[PDB]
Amino acid sequence: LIHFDRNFYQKMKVGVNPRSPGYFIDGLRALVKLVTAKYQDLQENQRFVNVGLEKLNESVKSLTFEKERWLNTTKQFSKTSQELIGNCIISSIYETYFGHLNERERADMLVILKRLLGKFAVKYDVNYRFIDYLVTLDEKMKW
């Protein structure tokens, strides 16, 4: 986040260092609010597949053991949770630093962010999309 803020002013802003840390604080405050929003919802859907695992085992019939074999989804959760920390990083930065940038200016910072996420031992979703990640289809309709 330090290496991103240092790169944001370095690339984007013109006029030499009159202005300083603001977004940085708000970018951090977004991440905390976003990880807590996402980990409460990761564990909520993990609780919905664990309560469905309890209910299928109670029943057991011809095709139902395919549903039981839904440890692919249960196996899938670990990979999903591995990336949520670094996924929240990008989401927070988009909400805070990107709002007033150009189509191209957003994309390009994303590159610098992702390659910063690449150096660090942080895992992010390679096929990532800001819209789909934080917009809900009920809100996407509403707007």
């Binding site: 919905f48 469905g52 209910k55 095709l63 999309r129 789909d132 289809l137």
Partner: protein, 79 residues
């Protein structure tokens, strides 16, 4: 034209089927709790869950061709 048409339904049926996956999981558990001491009514939703074997695996069908579509999309952005 073929891939720009499939680009829209790619992320559409991504969200639609996953919202239908969350929608049909809920429809299944509502009747499983109502019909458990009753007859196999669940069966009347299980033929719809037999249709879901196309839907659950439709997702898997489309995710497999996505890993093929995306790198071709990004090749076309350059020209």
């Amino acid at each position: 034209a073929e891939m720009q048409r499939k680009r829209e339904d790619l992320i559409k049926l991504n969200t639609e089927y996953k919202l239908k996956l969350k929608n049909l999981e809920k429809r299944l558990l509502e009747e499983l709790n109502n019909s458990q001491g009753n007859m196999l009514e669940n069966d009347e939703l299980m033929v719809t869950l037999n249709n879901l074997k196309k839907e659950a695996m439709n997702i898997e069908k489309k995710l497999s061709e996505s890993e093929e579509f995306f790198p071709q999309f990004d090749n076309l952005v350059e020209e």
